[PDB]
């Protein structure tokens, strides 16, 4: 019921700013603090900041003071994280949550990757990973979708919407000499019912505002 | 600032054992006034957010499994799973709560050992779609395997391919604890309609002797 939905994902160019929002629901907004932290892979957890929306007080972890601000709307619920001066090491995820006075943040986004790059946006192209009778196993079949040559991530992707969770597997995207990246997603089904069933890849790459839905069929040859 | 340290970085154990962690802060994390001792568990999955385990040391927030209990004072603090279940493959990470900064130690990645299944393989062409664009990419999937170390080498006529692939490896899976792998070999439109046969060919610590996978272009 407490929900914190972050903006999408971005690419920003060095000594450009990001403002990363955190959309509140389910509480009452200026009775809590909003904590933000990153995380690099690798690197782990670091705290940026904290702020209670109910008079905009905000706590910053020195190590970010002067290149984070937070600021919270109480018209809209919405608390915001601007991080300027951006540089290849800012490039992580990005967490806001939520912490009640004396608990622990709780609640915590999605997160939100930054990637700061002077390389611009490219969008996926997306292909079908047809089943066949060469991906088949004892009344089984798998079937997917290939990401192709995107850049920034993350690509996300899931399956009919959500309501086919089962048997996916969504691979971490590669790196192309490019520089771009790709990925895959496969979902293993019955092959019983490859006929009467619909099988649609849903591929979002927010950075680029790409939204691309694939329906994956057997085909005929 | 307090600096939290975790151990060890990783561990591997079987279901149902006993698993425990430590964490240790370069301070002391136990308040006077209310003698709560301010440490905070997360567990973390590859791609998710951190999830709120345990506060105050050992308050377990509503929700979490009694499976999972903190535990420890002052600057010394440890985190027990005292049955591991497969979903609790994770990293646990401490936070100092104390005092401003908050800072968190590295973490503890906890895996999963379990029997050895062998790979199931499969061969996707290159789509119609995809040809048009001026290029062939061909997909080879490694489905549910254990231990993770799969090794696929492509195969085109019978000759192995160097320098045209790229592969990746999944997390460990939360329900069954195996892996699964996707190698893609990519080749312009004009190479791939010069060849007739492409396998991707399999060795795993499952199997006997290689599988292979393959489809004739065209056929």
Redesign the interface.
């Known amino acids: 019921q407490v929900q914190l939905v972050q903006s999408g994902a971005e690419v920003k160019k060095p000594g450009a700013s990001v403002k990363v929002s955190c959309k509140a629901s389910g509480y009452t907004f200026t009775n809590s603090w909003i904590?933000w932290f990153r995380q690099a892979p690798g690197q782990?957890?670091?705290?940026i900041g904290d702020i209670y929306p109910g008079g905009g007080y905000t706590?910053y972890?020195?190590?970010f003071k002067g290149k984070a601000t937070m600021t919270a709307d109480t018209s809209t619920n919405t608390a915001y994280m601007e991080l300027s001066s951006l540089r290849s090491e800012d490039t992580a995820v990005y967490?806001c949550?939520r912490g009640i006075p004396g608990?622990?943040?709780?609640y915590?986004?999605?997160?939100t990757l930054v990637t700061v790059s002077s390389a611009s946006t490219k969008g996926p192209?997306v292909?079908?990973?047809?089943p066949?009778s060469?991906?088949?196993?004892g009344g089984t079949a798998?079937l997917?979708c290939?990401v192709?040559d995107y850049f920034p991530e993350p690509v996300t992707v899931s399956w009919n919407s959500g309501a086919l969770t089962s048997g996916v597997?969504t691979?971490?995207?590669?790196?192309?000499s490019s520089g771009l990246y790709?990925?895959?997603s496969?979902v293993?089904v019955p092959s019983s019912s490859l006929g009467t069933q619909t099988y649609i890849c849903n591929v979002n790459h927010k950075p680029s505002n790409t939204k691309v839905d694939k329906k994956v069929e057997p085909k005929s040859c | 600032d307090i600096q939290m340290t975790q151990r060890p970085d990783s561990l591997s154990a079987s279901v149902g054992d006993r698993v425990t962690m430590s964490c240790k802060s370069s301070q002391s994390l136990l308040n006077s006034g209310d003698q709560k001792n301010y440490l905070?568990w997360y567990q973390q999955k590859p791609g998710q957010?951190?999830?709120?385990l345990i506060?105050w040391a050992s308050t377990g927030?509503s929700g979490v499994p009694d499976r999972f209990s903190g535990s420890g004072s002052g600057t010394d603090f440890t985190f027990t799973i005292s049955s591991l279940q497969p979903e609790d493959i994770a990293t646990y990470?401490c936070?100092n709560?104390y005092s401003?900064?908050?800072?968190?130690?590295?973490?503890t990645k906890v895996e999963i050992k379990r029997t050895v299944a062998a790979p199931?393989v499969?061969?996707?062409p290159?789509?119609d779609?995809?040809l048009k664009?001026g290029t062939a990419?061909v997909?080879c999937?490694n489905?549910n395997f254990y231990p993770k170390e799969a090794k696929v080498q492509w195969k085109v006529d019978n000759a192995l391919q160097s320098g045209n692939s790229?592969?990746?490896?999944?997390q460990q899976d939360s329900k069954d604890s195996t892996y699964?792998?996707?190698s893609?070999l990519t080749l312009s439109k004009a190479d791939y309609e010069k060849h007739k046969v492409y396998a991707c060919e399999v060795t795993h610590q499952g199997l006997s002797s290689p599988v292979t996978?393959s489809?004739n272009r065209g056929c």
Request: no cysteine; hydrophobic share 30%; aromatic share 16%.
């Open positions: 904590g782990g957890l670091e705290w706590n972890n020195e190590i967490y949550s608990y622990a943040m709780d915590w986004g999605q997160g192209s292909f079908p990973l047809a066949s060469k991906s088949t196993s798998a997917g290939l192709k597997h691979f971490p995207a590669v790196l192309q790709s990925l895959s496969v293993t | 905070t957010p951190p999830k709120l506060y927030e990470y936070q709560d401003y900064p908050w800072t968190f130690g590295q973490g199931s499969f061969i996707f290159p789509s779609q995809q664009s990419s997909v999937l489905n790229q592969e990746s490896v999944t699964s792998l996707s893609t996978k489809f």
